[PDB]
Amino acid sequence: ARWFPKTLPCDVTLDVSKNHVIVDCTDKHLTEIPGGIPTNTTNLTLTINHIPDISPASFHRLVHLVEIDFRCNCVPCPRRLQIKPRSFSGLTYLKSLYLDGNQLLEIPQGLPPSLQLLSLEANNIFSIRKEQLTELANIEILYLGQNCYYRNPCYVSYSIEKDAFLNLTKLKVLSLKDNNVTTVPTVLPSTLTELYLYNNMIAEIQEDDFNNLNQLQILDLSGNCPRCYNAPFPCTPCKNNSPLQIPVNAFDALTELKVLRLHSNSLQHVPPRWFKNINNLQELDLSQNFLAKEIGDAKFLHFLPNLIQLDLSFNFELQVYRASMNLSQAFSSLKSLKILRIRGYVFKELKSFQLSPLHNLQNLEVLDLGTNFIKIANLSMFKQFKRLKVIDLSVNKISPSGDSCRFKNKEASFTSVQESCYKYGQTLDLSKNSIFFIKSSDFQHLSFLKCLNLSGNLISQTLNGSEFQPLAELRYLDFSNNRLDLLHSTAFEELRKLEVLDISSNSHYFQSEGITHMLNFTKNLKVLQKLMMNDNDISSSTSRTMESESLRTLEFRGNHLDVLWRDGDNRYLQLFKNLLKLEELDISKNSLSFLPSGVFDGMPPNLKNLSLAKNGLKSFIWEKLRYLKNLETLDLSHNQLTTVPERLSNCSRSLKNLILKNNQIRSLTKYFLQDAFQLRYLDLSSNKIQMIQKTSFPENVLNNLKMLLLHHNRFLCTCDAVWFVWWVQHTEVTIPYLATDVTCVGPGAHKGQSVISLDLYTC
Amino acid sequence: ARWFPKTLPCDVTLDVSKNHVIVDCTDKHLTEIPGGIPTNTTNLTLTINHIPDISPASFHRLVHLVEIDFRCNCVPCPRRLQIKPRSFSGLTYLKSLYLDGNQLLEIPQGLPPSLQLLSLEANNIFSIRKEQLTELANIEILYLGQNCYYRNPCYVSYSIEKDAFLNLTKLKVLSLKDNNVTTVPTVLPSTLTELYLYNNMIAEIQEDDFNNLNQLQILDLSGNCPRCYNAPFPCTPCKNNSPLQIPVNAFDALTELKVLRLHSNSLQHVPPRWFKNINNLQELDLSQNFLAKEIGDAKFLHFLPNLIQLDLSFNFELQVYRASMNLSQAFSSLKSLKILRIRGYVFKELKSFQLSPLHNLQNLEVLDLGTNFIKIANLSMFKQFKRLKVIDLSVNKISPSGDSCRFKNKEASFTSVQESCYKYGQTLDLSKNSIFFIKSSDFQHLSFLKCLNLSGNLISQTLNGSEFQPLAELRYLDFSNNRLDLLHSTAFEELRKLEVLDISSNSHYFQSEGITHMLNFTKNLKVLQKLMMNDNDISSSTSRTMESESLRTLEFRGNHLDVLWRDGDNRYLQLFKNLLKLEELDISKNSLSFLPSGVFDGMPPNLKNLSLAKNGLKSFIWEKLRYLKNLETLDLSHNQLTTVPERLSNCSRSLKNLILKNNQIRSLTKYFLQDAFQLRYLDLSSNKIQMIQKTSFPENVLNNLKMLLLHHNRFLCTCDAVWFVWWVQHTEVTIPYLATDVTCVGPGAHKGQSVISLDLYTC
Numbered sequence A, B: 001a002r003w004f005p006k007t008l009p010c011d012v013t014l015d016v017s018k019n020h021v022i023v024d025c026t027d028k029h030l031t032e033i034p035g036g037i038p039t040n041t042t043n044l045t046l047t048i049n050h051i052p053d054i055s056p057a058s059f060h061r062l063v064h065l066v067e068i069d070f071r072c073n074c075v076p077c078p079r080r081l082q083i084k085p086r087s088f089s090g091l092t093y094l095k096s097l098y099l100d101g102n103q104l105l106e107i108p109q110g111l112p113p114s115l116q117l118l119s120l121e122a123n124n125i126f127s128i129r130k131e132q133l134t135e136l137a138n139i140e141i142l143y144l145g146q147n148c149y150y151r152n153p154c155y156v157s158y159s160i161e162k163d164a165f166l167n168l169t170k171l172k173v174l175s176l177k178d179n180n181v182t183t184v185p186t187v188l189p190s191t192l193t194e195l196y197l198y199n200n201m202i203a204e205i206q207e208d209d210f211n212n213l214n215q216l217q218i219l220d221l222s223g224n225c226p227r228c229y230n231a232p233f234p235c236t237p238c239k240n241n242s243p244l245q246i247p248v249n250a251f252d253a254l255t256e257l258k259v260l261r262l263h264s265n266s267l268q269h270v271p272p273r274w275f276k277n278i279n280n281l282q283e284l285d286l287s288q289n290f291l292a293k294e295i296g297d298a299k300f301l302h303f304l305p306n307l308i309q310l311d312l313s314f315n316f317e318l319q320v321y322r323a324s325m326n327l328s329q330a331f332s333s334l335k336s337l338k339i340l341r342i343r344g345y346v347f348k349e350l351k352s353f354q355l356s357p358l359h360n361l362q363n364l365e366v367l368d369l370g371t372n373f374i375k376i377a378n379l380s381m382f383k384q385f386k387r388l389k390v391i392d393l394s395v396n397k398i399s400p401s402g403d404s405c406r407f408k409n410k411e412a413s414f415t416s417v418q419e420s421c422y423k424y425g426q427t428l429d430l431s432k433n434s435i436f437f438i439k440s441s442d443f444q445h446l447s448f449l450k451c452l453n454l455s456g457n458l459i460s461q462t463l464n465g466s467e468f469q470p471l472a473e474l475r476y477l478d479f480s481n482n483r484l485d486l487l488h489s490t491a492f493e494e495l496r497k498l499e500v501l502d503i504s505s506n507s508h509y510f511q512s513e514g515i516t517h518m519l520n521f522t523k524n525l526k527v528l529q530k531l532m533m534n535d536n537d538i539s540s541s542t543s544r545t546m547e548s549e550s551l552r553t554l555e556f557r558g559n560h561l562d563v564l565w566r567d568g569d570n571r572y573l574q575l576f577k578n579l580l581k582l583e584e585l586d587i588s589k590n591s592l593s594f595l596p597s598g599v600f601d602g603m604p605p606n607l608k609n610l611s612l613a614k615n616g617l618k619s620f621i622w623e624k625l626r627y628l629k630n631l632e633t634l635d636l637s638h639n640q641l642t643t644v645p646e647r648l649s650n651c652s653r654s655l656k657n658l659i660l661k662n663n664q665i666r667s668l669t670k671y672f673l674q675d676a677f678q679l680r681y682l683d684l685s686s687n688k689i690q691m692i693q694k695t696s697f698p699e700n701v702l703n704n705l706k707m708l709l710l711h712h713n714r715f716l717c718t719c720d721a722v723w724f725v726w727w728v729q730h731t732e733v734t735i736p737y738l739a740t741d742v743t744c745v746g747p748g749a750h751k752g753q754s755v756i757s758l759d760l761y762t763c
C-alpha cells in the first residue's frame, strides 16, 4: 500500500492480488538503510552495499516484512558484519531471510519462530551445535553451504554435533555444499526431501546414513573423491585414487527418490543392488567417473524402468583412445529415457550397429554425443532416429565420407542451453566439426531434418544449388564462422522450405575485392523469413538490388556500408528497396559517418524496426524520415549526433521508440516534442544535455510516455530549471535510476546532488 | 666521394672499394628533388613521393649516376608523371633505371645507349612497337609486367607488333606478367635466358613459339587458363575449363632450361614428350592443376633424372575425398630429387607402403605433406626416412593412434620459410594437428628426431616425465598454443638432450588460481639453453625459485609479474636468482607499475640483456642498477618513466645500450652523461624533452657513441639552445632521421623547422 513514496532510491512494485510490496535496492552503494521505508512493504532487498552492521531499530516500525535479503553485503571489505541481539524478534511475519556473504562467524540468534527459509552461504560458520539450532525448530529450508572450500578457506574440517538436525521436524531442504564435511551428519530428520552434500570431503558412506530418510527426493553426493585429471579448479583426489565407498544396502530406505547425482566421484563399478529399492528414480548423474568399462556392461540399468535423464559424460580412460563406442545391450531397458549424454567417451569411429540398443527407445528425444573426437561417422545411420528431437554432433572431428550474490533460487538444476534452432523440429548440431566440403550424398536419408547447424566448420565452398539436395524439409540452416563464396545467385535454391538462413562470420571471401558477390540469391528463396549475414565485412556487391518477396528480418551489422553508399556512387542506394515484406533492419557498426540523401527513399515501404547503433553518424538528417511511413523503433544509440530535429511531429507520424543512448547532444529544440502524441518511448541517456525548457516538454505528450531515460548525463542544477525540478518530482513518468545515476554537475556545492531530492527555496 | 654533405635529407653510403655512392630518399615526401646532390653519387633513390614531373635539369650536373630508381612515385594521386624530352641523354654512365608505378602511357624516349636494365611495371603501357624499342638495342633486362590486370585494368588486350623484340640482341630477361597478353610475342631474341609470361590470358601455344630459344633457362607460364575454384582473387577460367593447349613438340629447342613453372594451368595430362629434350631440368612446378589422376601414373617422371624440386600442391579433385594417396612407381626415377611438395592432395589415410617409391631417394631432404586432412597416419612409418631433413605434418587432422614499390629483385623465386627449428637437424612439423594427448608408444621408432613442432594442437595433458620417452636425441620442442598443466616438476625430465623449450600460449591452466604451478621443472634439464614461456599469464607459482645450471635465455613476456612481486609479498623476489648462467631476460608487458626494492638484488649474477618494454613503469629506481655488474642492454621502451638518473656513471659501470623509446621525459639531469665512457648506444626518441644543455652532453662521451636517436620528440628551437644547434650540425654522431622526423615545436614561425637546417644569426 501507501502507493506514493517520497525519496526512496529503490524501485517499488505493488501486487494488489498477492498483497506483496517489493523494494529492490540492488547495487545502490547505500552505507545505511535509507529513511522513509514504507511499513506496508513485504520484500526488502539489501544486497551488495556498504552497510557496517545491523541494528534493532532498522526494522523497528516494519512489522509486515516477510522477506529480508542481505546477500553479499561484504565480499572478502571492512570488518565482518555484526548483528545486535534481538534484531529480528520484532518481525513476527518474517518467513524468509538471506544472510549470504556476510563473513558471519556463528549462526545469528533471536530469529522469529515464523521463519521458514534461512541462507548462510559464503560465511565463516564451520561449527554446528544444537543450542544455536534450537530456535530454528520451525525452519523448512536451510542453506549452510560454501562455508569452507578453496575460494573461502577456513583450514578446519566441518564439525556437526550428534543429532543436530534431528529436532528440526519441519526441515525439508538442507544444503552443505563446499563445507569441507567429512561425515554425513546423522541423524537427519525423516521429513527431509532434498539433501545437498556435494563438493565435500566425504570418503565413506555408512549403511545407516540414510536409514530414516523415506521422503527424500533429491540426493547429491558429487565431488566426494573427485576425478582431478585436467581439473581447471583446485581439488584433492582421495588416497590411492580410491572411489567413494558406498555400501550395496545404502539406498534401501529411499523409496521416493527421484534425482540422484554421483558426478565426479571416481566410481569404477555401479552395483545393481543400489537401485533395487528406488524404482521411481527419474534423473541419474554419473559423469566425471571411471565407468568406461561399466558402460559396456551397465548391468544396473535393468533396475531403472522409469529413468528420464541419464548423464554419463566425460568417463574417458587415461591414455586410451577407444576404436568404437561400447554400448551395453541393457540400454534397451530404459523405456522412459528421454535425454542421454555420452560426451567425453572419446572414440575413433561410430557405427550404426553401435546404437542398436537405443533403436527401441520410443521416448528418447535428445542424444548428446559431442566432444568425443569421432573421426568416421556415417550420417545415414540416423535415418532410424526420426523420432529424436536433438542429435548432438559437436566439436568432435566428423569429416565428409571418403571413397551467492545472485541466483536467489540457490540449489537449481542445470538448465540446458535452449538454442534458437531447437524449436523448429529435428536438429542435427554438426557445429565445430572437421567437415571441409559438402556433398549431397553425405546428407542422404536425412529428409526429416528440420534443423542443421554447421557453424565453425570453416567450409570453403562455392555452392551453386545442389549441395543440400536431400534436405527437402529443412527450415533452419546455420553457416556461421565459415568461408562461403557467393559467386552464384543459385545458392540455397534447392532449400525450398528454408525459413531462416545464417551466413554470418563469412568475412574471408567477402573481404576480397573484384570477385562477384551475388547478393540477389534470396530471390529464389520463396518462404525465407529471417536472414542473418552480419559481421561479413561486405564492401562490394555485383547485384545492384536484393530481391525477396517474403523476407521480414535482415541483420546487416558489422559490414562496410560506407563504401557501398560512398559519395558519388548511387548504384547501391536502393539496395533494400525490393524487400517488399521487410519489417526489421539491423544495419549497425557499418562505419557510416553520414547518410547520403536518397537512401531513405530507397528503403522498403514496410520498414518498422531500423537500427543504426554504433555507426558514428556525424550528422543525421531528420526531414527525410517522412518517407518511412511505418517507422516505429528508430535507434541511433552509441552515435555521434549533435542536433535533435526541429519538430519530431513533422519528421515522422508514427515514431514511438526513439533511442539516442550514449550520444553527444548538448541541447534540445524549443519544439522538440510539439504535437508528437504518437511517441511512447524516448531515450536521451549518457548525453551532454544541460537543461530542458517547458515549451519543449509539454505535459500532454509526457502523460502517455511509457518510459523515459535521462540518467548518467550532464544536467546542471541551477535556478534556470525550476520547472524541470518541479516536474521531475511531481510526475508519474517512469524514469529509471532517478535518484542513483542522474546527478547535478553544479554549481559549486550542488555536485552529485539528486534532482528528485532538490528543493530550491531561494528560487 | 665528397664525404661531407651539407643539407641532404637522404642517407649516404660510401664504398671506396666498389667506387659506389648510395643516396636513399625512401619515404621522404619530397615534392621536388633537393639541391646539393653530390656529383659523385652512383645510385639515386627517388621512391614514393610527390614529384610532379621529371625535368632535364634534374640530372644536369650528375654525370656519374649509374642507377636511378623512381618506383611508385604516383600510386593510383595527381595526374600521371610527365617526362620532358632528352631528360636522360646526359647520363652516359647510366646502366639501370626504374620507372615502376608512374602511370606512364608510352615507353620514355631518349634513354642513353648504355642502359642495361629498364623497369616499367604498374604502368599504362599496353602497346609495344619496334620504333620505341629501337633505342633499347643495348638493353639486357626488361620489366613490362603488371600493365593490365585486375588491380590495374586497361580494358584492352596487350598488343605486340611482329618481331618487336627480335633486334634486342642483348636481351636476357623479359617479363610480361599480368599484362593481359593473348599470344606469345614471336619472335623473341635467341639470347633470352629468363621468360616470364605468367598470369596472362594465353590460351594456346604454337610449335614454333620457342623454336629459336636455345639459351633459355627459366620459363614461366602460370595463370594461363587457371584453376579458379575457391580463388580469393579475381580470375577467369578459360572456356569449357579447357587446359592450356601445349603441343608435344613445344619444348624441343630448349636444351639449357632449368626452371619450368606450370602452376595454375588447369592441366589434366602431362605427356612425357614435353621432357624428351630438356634433360637438365632442375625445378618443375605443377601446382593448382587437375593432375590428381596423373600423379597415379606420372609416366613423364622417367625423363627427369636431374630434377631437384617438384611441386604438385593443391591438385585435389572437386567433391572427391580420396581414401589414400596414390603415388606412382615412377617416382623412384627422381634420383636427384631433394624437395617434394604434395600438399592439397586431400586424402583420408596415409600408409607406409604408399611412400615406397620415395624409399630409394638418397638425396631427398624435404617431404611436404601438409594441408591434406590426413586422418590416420602411423608415425612409425617414418623410421625409414632418417636421411630426411624436414618432414611436414601440418594442419591436416592426424590424431593419436587408437586401440613493385619494394623488392627491387623483382622476379625472384619463392623463398621457403626457414623456421627456427630446421637448423637443429631432423624436423617433424606436426603443428595444428588433431593430436589431443601424447603417448610414448606413438613416438616409437623416432629416436633420430632432433626437432618436433606441436604448436596449435590444443593438447590438455599433465606430463610427469614419461610421454616423450623414445625422443632421446630431441633438442628442440615446441609446445605453443596448447594447454599444459604444470602440476609436476618432473615434466620434460626424460628429454635429456633438450636445448630449447617453448611452452608459450599456454594461458589456460596458468590463468587458474589455487592449482600448483611447478616452475622449478627446469632443474632436471641439464643442457637446456633457451626457454620461451611468454604470453602465459602466470600469476602464481608454487615453487619459490627457478633453478637451472645451463639456461642462458628466458622469455617471460605477457605474464602477470605484478601479482608475483606485489607489495608485502617477498616470496618471489629472488625468482630468477638461481639461474646462474642466465644472460638474457625478457620480462615485458607484465603490467609492472613499479619495481619493488629487492628484485635487482635477486637478479642472476650474469644477467646481460634486460628488457622491461611496454610495462608502464611509473617510477623506475636507478641506484639499484649497481647490483647488476654485467648489465649492458637495459631496455625501458614504451614505458611511463619521467626522470633520468642523476649520474649514469654512478648507476651502472657497464651499461652501453640504454633505450628509452616512446617514453615521457621532459628534461635531463645536468650530469646525465658525466664520466660515462662505457656507453655506446642511447635512445631518447618519442619523448617530451625540451632542451639539452652542454654540461649534460660532453663531447668526449659523444665521440665514442655509435648511434643516438632524438627524433619524433618535442624539442623547442629557441635561442636557449645555441650550443645544441651548433653541435647537431657539426658532429659526426650517427643521428637517423635528423632532417625528416625531428622538428621544432616553436616559437611561432619555427614550427616544423629542421634543427640541422637552423642558423640563428640573431642569437
Ligand SMILES: *[C@@H]1O[C@H](CO)[C@@H](O[C@@H]2O[C@H](CO)[C@@H](O[C@@H]3O[C@H](CO[C@H]4O[C@H](CO)[C@@H](O)[C@H](O)[C@@H]4O)[C@@H](O)[C@H](O)[C@@H]3O)[C@H](O)[C@H]2NC(C)=O)[C@H](O)[C@H]1NC(C)=O
Residues within 6 Å of the ligand: A020, A022, A042, A043, A066, A067, A095, A096, A116, A409
Ligand atoms: C517475496 O518474498 C516471498 C516470501 O517471503 C516470496 O514468495 C515465495 O515465492 C516462491 C516462488 O517464487 C515460492 O516458492 C514455491 O515453491 C513451491 C515448490 O516448488 C519447488 O519446486 C520447483 C520446481 O518444480 C522450484 O522451482 C521451486 O523453487 C521449489 O523448489 C511451488 O509449488 C510454489 O508454486 C512456489 O513456486 C515460495 O513458497 C514463496 N514463499 C512464501 C513464504 O510464500 C516472493 O516470491 C518474493 N517476491 C519477490 C518479487 O521476490
Ligand SMILES: *[C@@H]1O[C@H](CO)[C@@H](O[C@@H]2O[C@H](CO)[C@@H](O[C@@H]3O[C@H](CO[C@H]4O[C@H](CO)[C@@H](O)[C@H](O)[C@@H]4O)[C@@H](O)[C@H](O)[C@@H]3O)[C@H](O)[C@H]2NC(C)=O)[C@H](O)[C@H]1NC(C)=O
Residues within 6 Å of the ligand: B020, B022, B042, B043, B066, B067, B095, B096, B116, B409
Ligand atoms: C647500385 O646500382 C648498381 C647498378 O647500377 C648495382 O649493381 C648491381 O648489383 C647487383 C647485385 O646486387 C648485380 O647483380 C648481379 O647478378 C649476377 C647474376 O646473378 C643472377 O642470379 C642470381 C641468383 O643466382 C640473382 O640473385 C641475381 O639477382 C641475378 O638475377 C650475379 O652473378 C652478380 O654477382 C650480381 O649479383 C648487378 O649486375 C649490378 N649491376 C651492375 C650494372 O653492375 C648496385 O647493387 C646498387 N647498389 C645499391 C646499394 O643499391
Ligand SMILES: *[C@@H]1O[C@H](CO)[C@@H](O[C@@H]2O[C@H](CO)[C@@H](O[C@@H]3O[C@H](CO)[C@@H](O)[C@H](O)[C@@H]3O)[C@H](O)[C@H]2NC(C)=O)[C@H](O)[C@H]1NC(C)=O
Residues within 6 Å of the ligand: A148, A149, A150, A152, A153, A154, A155, A156, A157, A158, A180
Ligand atoms: C578442510 O579440512 C582439512 C582438515 O584436515 C584441512 O586440512 C588441514 O589444513 C591445514 C591448513 O593447511 C593444515 O595445517 C597445516 O599444518 C602443517 C603442519 O602439519 C603446517 O606446517 C601448515 O602451515 C598448516 O598449518 C592441516 O594439517 C590440515 N589437516 C590435515 C589432517 O592434513 C583443509 O585445509 C580444509 N580445507 C580448506 C579449504 O580449508
Ligand SMILES: *[C@@H]1O[C@H](CO)[C@@H](O[C@@H]2O[C@H](CO)[C@@H](O[C@@H]3O[C@H](CO)[C@@H](O)[C@H](O)[C@@H]3O)[C@H](O)[C@H]2NC(C)=O)[C@H](O)[C@H]1NC(C)=O
Residues within 6 Å of the ligand: A419, A420, A421, A422, A429, A431, A432, A453, A454, A455, A456, A478
Ligand atoms: C550452432 O552451434 C554453435 C556452437 O555450438 C552455437 O554458437 C554458440 O551459441 C551459444 C549460445 O548462443 C553461445 O554462448 C554464448 O556465448 C556468449 C559469448 O560469446 C555469452 O556471452 C553468452 O552468455 C552465451 O554463453 C556460444 O558462444 C556460441 N559459440 C560460438 C563459437 O559462436 C550456435 O548458436 C548454434 N546455432 C544454432 C542455430 O543453434
Ligand SMILES: *[C@@H]1O[C@H](CO)[C@@H](O[C@@H]2O[C@H](CO)[C@@H](O[C@@H]3O[C@H](CO)[C@@H](O)[C@H](O)[C@@H]3O)[C@H](O)[C@H]2NC(C)=O)[C@H](O)[C@H]1NC(C)=O
Residues within 6 Å of the ligand: B148, B149, B150, B152, B153, B154, B155, B156, B157, B158, B180
Ligand atoms: C583483358 O583484355 C580483354 C580483351 O577482350 C578485355 O575484355 C574486354 O573488356 C572490356 C571492358 O569490360 C569489354 O568492353 C565491354 O563491352 C560491352 C559491350 O560488349 C559493354 O557493354 C561494356 O560496358 C564494356 O565496355 C570488352 O567487350 C571485352 N572484350 C571481350 C572480347 O569480351 C579485358 O577487360 C581485359 N582485362 C583487364 C583487366 O583490363
Ligand SMILES: *[C@@H]1O[C@H](CO)[C@@H](O[C@@H]2O[C@H](CO)[C@@H](O[C@@H]3O[C@H](CO)[C@@H](O)[C@H](O)[C@@H]3O)[C@H](O)[C@H]2NC(C)=O)[C@H](O)[C@H]1NC(C)=O
Residues within 6 Å of the ligand: B419, B420, B421, B422, B429, B431, B432, B453, B454, B455, B456, B478
Ligand atoms: C611450428 O609451427 C607453427 C605453425 O606452422 C609455426 O608458427 C608460425 O610461424 C610463422 C613464422 O614464425 C608465423 O609467420 C609469421 O606470422 C606473423 C603474424 O603473426 C607475420 O607478421 C610474420 O611476417 C610471419 O609471416 C606464423 O604466424 C606462425 N603461426 C602461428 C599459428 O603462430 C611455428 O613457428 C613453428 N615452430 C617452429 C619451432 O618451427
Ligand SMILES: *[C@@H]1O[C@H](CO)[C@@H](O[C@@H]2O[C@H](CO)[C@@H](O)[C@H](O)[C@H]2NC(C)=O)[C@H](O)[C@H]1NC(C)=O
Residues within 6 Å of the ligand: A293, A294, A295, A296, A297, A326
Ligand atoms: C564391451 O564391454 C563388455 C563388458 O565390459 C565386454 O565384455 C567383456 O569382455 C571381457 C574381455 O574380453 C571379458 O573378459 C568379459 O567376460 C566380458 N564380459 C561380458 C559380460 O561379456 C566386451 O568385450 C566389450 N566389447 C568391446 C568391443 O570392447
Ligand SMILES: *[C@@H]1O[C@H](CO)[C@@H](O[C@@H]2O[C@H](CO)[C@@H](O)[C@H](O)[C@H]2NC(C)=O)[C@H](O)[C@H]1NC(C)=O
Residues within 6 Å of the ligand: A378, A379, A380, A381, A401, A402
Ligand atoms: C552409409 O550408410 C548408407 C546406408 O546404410 C550407405 O548407403 C549405401 O550406398 C551403397 C552405394 O551407394 C548402396 O549400394 C547401398 O544400397 C546403400 N545402402 C542402403 C541401405 O541403401 C552408405 O554407403 C554409407 N556410407 C558409407 C561412406 O559407406
Ligand SMILES: *[C@@H]1O[C@H](CO)[C@@H](O[C@@H]2O[C@H](CO)[C@@H](O)[C@H](O)[C@H]2NC(C)=O)[C@H](O)[C@H]1NC(C)=O
Residues within 6 Å of the ligand: A464, A465, A466, B318, B319
Ligand atoms: C553445380 O555444381 C556441380 C558440381 O560441379 C555440377 O555438377 C557437375 O556438372 C558438370 C556439368 O554438367 C558435370 O560434367 C559433372 O560431372 C558434375 N559433377 C557432379 C559431381 O555431378 C552441377 O552441374 C552444377 N549445376 C549447375 C546448375 O550449375
Ligand SMILES: *[C@@H]1O[C@H](CO)[C@@H](O[C@@H]2O[C@H](CO)[C@@H](O)[C@H](O)[C@H]2NC(C)=O)[C@H](O)[C@H]1NC(C)=O
Residues within 6 Å of the ligand: A489, A490, A518, A520, A521, A523, A524, A542, A543, A544
Ligand atoms: C542477380 O544479379 C546478377 C547481375 O548482378 C544476374 O546475373 C545476370 O544474369 C543475366 C541473365 O542470365 C545475364 O544476362 C547477365 O549477364 C548476368 N550478369 C552478370 C554480371 O553475371 C543474376 O541473374 C541475378 N540473379 C537473380 C536470381 O536474379
Ligand SMILES: *[C@@H]1O[C@H](CO)[C@@H](O[C@@H]2O[C@H](CO)[C@@H](O)[C@H](O)[C@H]2NC(C)=O)[C@H](O)[C@H]1NC(C)=O
Residues within 6 Å of the ligand: B293, B294, B295, B296, B297, B326
Ligand atoms: C593409382 O593410379 C593408377 C594410374 O591412374 C591407377 O591405374 C589405373 O586404374 C584404372 C582404374 O582401374 C585402370 O583403368 C587403368 O588401366 C590403370 N592404369 C594403370 C597404368 O595401371 C590405379 O588404379 C590407382 N590406384 C588406386 C588405388 O587408386
Ligand SMILES: *[C@@H]1O[C@H](CO)[C@@H](O[C@@H]2O[C@H](CO)[C@@H](O)[C@H](O)[C@H]2NC(C)=O)[C@H](O)[C@H]1NC(C)=O
Residues within 6 Å of the ligand: B378, B379, B380, B381, B401, B402
Ligand atoms: C605402426 O607401425 C609399427 C611398425 O610397423 C607397429 O609396431 C608394431 O607393434 C606391434 C604391437 O605393439 C608389434 O607386435 C610389431 O612387432 C610392431 N612392428 C614392428 C615392425 O616391430 C605399430 O603397431 C603401428 N601402429 C599401429 C597403430 O598399428
Ligand SMILES: *[C@@H]1O[C@H](CO)[C@@H](O[C@@H]2O[C@H](CO)[C@@H](O)[C@H](O)[C@H]2NC(C)=O)[C@H](O)[C@H]1NC(C)=O
Residues within 6 Å of the ligand: A318, A319, B464, B465, B466
Ligand atoms: C607418470 O604417469 C603415468 C601415467 O599415469 C604412470 O603410469 C602409470 O603408473 C601407475 C602406477 O605405477 C600404473 O598403475 C599404471 O598402469 C601406469 N600406466 C601406464 C599407461 O603405464 C607413471 O607411473 C607415472 N610416473 C611417475 C614417475 O609418476
Ligand SMILES: *[C@@H]1O[C@H](CO)[C@@H](O[C@@H]2O[C@H](CO)[C@@H](O)[C@H](O)[C@H]2NC(C)=O)[C@H](O)[C@H]1NC(C)=O
Residues within 6 Å of the ligand: B489, B490, B518, B520, B521, B523, B524, B542, B543, B544
Ligand atoms: C619444486 O618445488 C616444489 C615445492 O614448491 C618441490 O616439492 C616438494 O618436494 C619435497 C621433496 O619431495 C617435498 O618434501 C615437499 O612436500 C614438496 N612440496 C610441495 C609443495 O609439493 C619439488 O620437489 C621441487 N622440484 C624440484 C625438481 O626441485
Ligand SMILES: *[C@@H]1O[C@H](CO)[C@@H](O)[C@H](O)[C@H]1NC(C)=O
Residues within 6 Å of the ligand: A608, A609, A632, A633
Ligand atoms: C522492434 O524491435 C524491438 C527490439 O526490442 C522490439 O521490442 C519491438 O517489438 C519491435 N517492433 C516490432 C513492430 O516488431
Ligand SMILES: *[C@@H]1O[C@H](CO)[C@@H](O)[C@H](O)[C@H]1NC(C)=O
Residues within 6 Å of the ligand: B608, B609, B632, B633
Ligand atoms: C642483447 O640483445 C640485443 C638485442 O638486439 C643484441 O643485439 C645484443 O647482441 C645482446 N647482447 C648480448 C651480450 O648478447
